[PDB]
């Protein structure tokens, strides 16, 4: 518990990085989180939305 | 752009659609700025023979 502040700083940085990475798997209302899956789907005019 | 097509091929003239007309002879770009005008001419062009 002596280096608790440094450990907390490192853990916060790592958690922020992990959250920013995991926020890619979200859909945000789209059809899928993978862009290649959306490309292999309805035409470009409808895929842009 | 003046041309004659089938009555069922009118939906293929719209930009970002499918069909043989929109993929083989006449395709509109995704940034088409204009209006599409069409009317029936059965008594004008079509012949009984």
From Swiss-Prot, chain A:
Domain of life per record: Viruses
Result of altering residue 40 to A: In strain: Alpha/B.1.1.7
Coiled-coil stretches: 7-49
Impact reported for residue 12 to H: In strain: Omicron/BA.1, Omicron/BA.2, Omicron/BA.2.12.1, Omicron/BA.2.75, Omicron/BA.4, Omicron/BA.5, Omicron/BQ.1.1, Omicron/XBB.1.5, Omicron/EG.5.1
Functional summary from the UniProt entry: Subunit of the fusion protein that is processed upon entry into the host cell. Mediates fusion of the virion and cellular membranes by functioning as a class I viral fusion protein. Contains a viral fusion peptide that is unmasked after S2 cleavage. This cleavage can occur at the cell membrane by host TMPRSS2 or during endocytosis by host CSTL. In either case, this triggers an extensive and irreversible conformational change that leads to fusion of the viral envelope with the cellular cytoplasmic membrane, releasing viral genomic RNA into the host cell cytoplasm.
Protein name, per record: Spike protein S2'
Species annotation: Severe acute respiratory syndrome coronavirus 2
Gene: S
